[PDB]
Amino acid sequence: QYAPQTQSGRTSIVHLFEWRWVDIALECERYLGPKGFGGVQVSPPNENIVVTNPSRPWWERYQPVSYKLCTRSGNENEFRDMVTRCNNVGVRIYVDAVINHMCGSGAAAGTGTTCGSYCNPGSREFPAVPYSAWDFNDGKCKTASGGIESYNDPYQVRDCQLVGLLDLALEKDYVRSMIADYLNKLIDIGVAGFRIDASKHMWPGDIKAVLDKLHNLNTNWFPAGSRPFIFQEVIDLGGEAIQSSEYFGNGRVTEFKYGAKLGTVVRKWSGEKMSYLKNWGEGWGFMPSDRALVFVDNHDNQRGHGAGGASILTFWDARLYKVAVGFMLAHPYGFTRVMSSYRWARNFVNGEDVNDWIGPPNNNGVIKEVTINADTTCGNDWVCEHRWREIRNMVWFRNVVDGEPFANWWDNGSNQVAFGRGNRGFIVFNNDDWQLSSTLQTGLPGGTYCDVISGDKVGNSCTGIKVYVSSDGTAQFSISNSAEDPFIAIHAESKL
Numbered sequence: 001q002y003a004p005q006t007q008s009g010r011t012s013i014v015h016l017f018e019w020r021w022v023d024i025a026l027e028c029e030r031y032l033g034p035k036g037f038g039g040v041q042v043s044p045p046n047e048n049i050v051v052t053n054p055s056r057p058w059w060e061r062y063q064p065v066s067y068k069l070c071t072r073s074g075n076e077n078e079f080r081d082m083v084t085r086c087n088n089v090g091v092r093i094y095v096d097a098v099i100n101h102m103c104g105s106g107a108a109a110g111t112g113t114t115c116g117s118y119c120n121p122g123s124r125e126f127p128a129v130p131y132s133a134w135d136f137n138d139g140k141c142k143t144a145s146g147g148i149e150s151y152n153d154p155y156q157v158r159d160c161q162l163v164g165l166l167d168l169a170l171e172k173d174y175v176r177s178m179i180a181d182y183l184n185k186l187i188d189i190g191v192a193g194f195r196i197d198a199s200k201h202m203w204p205g206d207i208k209a210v211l212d213k214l215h216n217l218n219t220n221w222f223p224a225g226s227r228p229f230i231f232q233e234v235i236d237l238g239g240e241a242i243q244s245s246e247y248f249g250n251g252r253v254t255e256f257k258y259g260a261k262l263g264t265v266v267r268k269w270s271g272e273k274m275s276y277l278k279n280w281g282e283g284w285g286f287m288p289s290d291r292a293l294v295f296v297d298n299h300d301n302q303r304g305h306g307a308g309g310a311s312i313l314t315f316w317d318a319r320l321y322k323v324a325v326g327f328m329l330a331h332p333y334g335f336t337r338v339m340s341s342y343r344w345a346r347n348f349v350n351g352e353d354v355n356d357w358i359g360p361p362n363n364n365g366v367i368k369e370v371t372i373n374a375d376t377t378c379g380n381d382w383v384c385e386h387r388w389r390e391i392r393n394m395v396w397f398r399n400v401v402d403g404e405p406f407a408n409w410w411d412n413g414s415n416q417v418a419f420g421r422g423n424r425g426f427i428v429f430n431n432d433d434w435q436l437s438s439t440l441q442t443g444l445p446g447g448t449y450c451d452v453i454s455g456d457k458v459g460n461s462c463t464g465i466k467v468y469v470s471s472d473g474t475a476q477f478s479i480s481n482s483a484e485d486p487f488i489a490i491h492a493e494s495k496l
């Protein structure tokens with residue numbers, strides 16, 4: 001459950017948030033495959049309720065009504081086609097499994113669903129599954145409102161309603177089996193693993209019981225006996241009743257402290273400095289590297305939802321975002337996930353974005369295609385961070401230095417920092433308000449390397465900064481505090 005099951009040499013996955021199956025299929029063949037991306041985390045592929053107020057928000061996909069592969073991203077044919085085409089080019093697919101609940105208990109009975117399935121939230125009727133009143137935790141929840149009134153009580157958070165969502169009685173074998181059948185169908189289709197949504201709201205044992213029923217991965221692409229990759233969404237910033245460690249037996253867990261702390265350090269808040277990152281990782285109180293799935297921001301916290309707060313860096317703060325993603329992709333800690341978002345009209349009234357609900361780029365409800373521009377960027381308001389040179393080249397960097405140990409750390413005692421990875425890569429950062437000009441030990445063999453942050457190595461030339469490393473591994477790095485990208489990165493494969 002801990003092994004990502006990516007094709008050898010590939011070390012990251014991209015969250016193609018709200019993308020349509022057809023666009024992902026294309027993206028796999030034209031970009032993800034050739035650019036060494038390990039895989040893609042897709043949005044919930046099962047049927048959800050249609051929320052008309054507000055107009056088709058992104059969160060309606062987290063309110064299931066059945067397990068039919070039928071959504072705004074596409075139908076089952078399109079889904080199967082995507083998985084096949086992506087696996088065929090070496091890019092795995094990971095599904096966002098929403099299994100702790102069904103739709104909002106307050107939703108209206110009817111066929112206002114993405115596939116037309118009938119459902120009656122009021123009576124807990126979900127005919128298309130099927131689920132009935134006795135498959136929910138209403139009777140087990142002890143709070144007056146039936147909702148989570150305190151996060152200090154493990155029972156409320158797991159047995160009661162998360163924001164009014166109907167809570168599934170996961171201790172029942174019937175429910176356990178319905179969910180397993182859904183996941184098994186996906187596994188057989190070719191999916192490599194899952195993101196267990198809202199794991200914190202389920203007992204580790206219930207998740208385990210479900211996982212034990214899962215099929216081995218499809219042998220058309222995976223070796224016989226391969227277990228699916230599992231990463232559970234557990235928001236634990238420390239100091240709360242439920243600990244992420246309670247889920248280590250099921251698979252990897254989302255380390256939310258990673259993005260919260262990094263954002264604060266890179267922004268230079270609360271007295272934090274980049275020089276403090278020397279012992280980044282478990283030294284900062286994070287979970288063991290091999291149990292962690294790390295990221296800078298995720299679909300929730302980039303828009304105020306979930307956890308992280310104001311410190312979280314997103315594509316909105318492009319410059320700082322790039323250095324944080326670069327640091328993450330360079331550091332050996334955890335399995336990295338890269339975010340890929342869409343632009344929305346933010347509108348902050350009282351420090352709160354009242355438009356945080358806005359769904360993906362659409363034409364009267366139907367999702368717009370991802371258009372690719374000549375300069376390799378995306379149109380139709382898809383930001384495509386994964387296509388930014390600075391990001392795509394760091395994904396490559398991670399592949400290249402995979403397995404090499406953290407080494408040759410250097411810092412100016414403030415915000416200028418540097419470290420390498422064995423003898424295959426080195427990265428330098430300047431987040432101070434002054435010039436960086438030093439001769440540092442890179443640990444790399446002598447030669448001329450193309451900086452992959454400012455450019456690329458084309459044939460036998462660099463399109464950006466070139467770094468000459470002496471026979472003794474040293475090199476000079478000159479980075480101005482006003483540089484567009486205040487960091488340089490070089491590796492074995494960018495060598496001329």
Ligand SMILES: C[C@H]1O[C@H](O[C@H]2[C@H](O)[C@@H](O)[C@H](O)O[C@@H]2CO)[C@H](O)[C@@H](O)[C@@H]1N[C@H]1C=C(CO)[C@@H](O[C@H]2O[C@H](CO)[C@@H](O[C@H]3O[C@H](C)[C@@H](N[C@H]4C=C(CO)[C@@H](O)[C@H](O)[C@H]4O)[C@H](O)[C@H]3O)[C@H](O)[C@H]2O)[C@H](O)[C@H]1O
Nearest residue numbers: 059060062063104105106163164198200235300305306307
């Ligand atoms: C979003 C994450 O919430 C929780 O994290 C909390 C941490 O546990 C806690 O430590 C931290 O301090 O605070 C966090 C919350 O800010 C979960 O632990 C975490 O798993 C969540 N992230 C996951 C999980 C979900 C749920 O599947 C997704 O949440 C989004 O989607 C829901 C559903 O669409 C959305 O809620 C909308 O719908 C419900 C029904 C509305 N609730 C109203 C309706 C009724 C009647 O049914 C009333 O009873 C309710 O009281 C009333 O509020 C919501 O108003 C509406 O927004 C969430 O807002 C979305 O965030 C996440 O996407 C997923 O990543």
Ligand SMILES: OC[C@H]1O[C@@H](O)[C@H](O)[C@@H](O)[C@@H]1O
Nearest residue numbers: 261271272276279283284285
């Ligand atoms: O050593 C790790 C610690 O270093 C301190 O200087 C920082 O302020 C802490 O946030 C961090 O956890």
Ligand SMILES: [Ca+2]
Nearest residue numbers: 158167201202
């Ligand atoms: Ca629950």
Ligand SMILES: [Cl-]
Nearest residue numbers: 195233254298
């Ligand atoms: Cl997540």
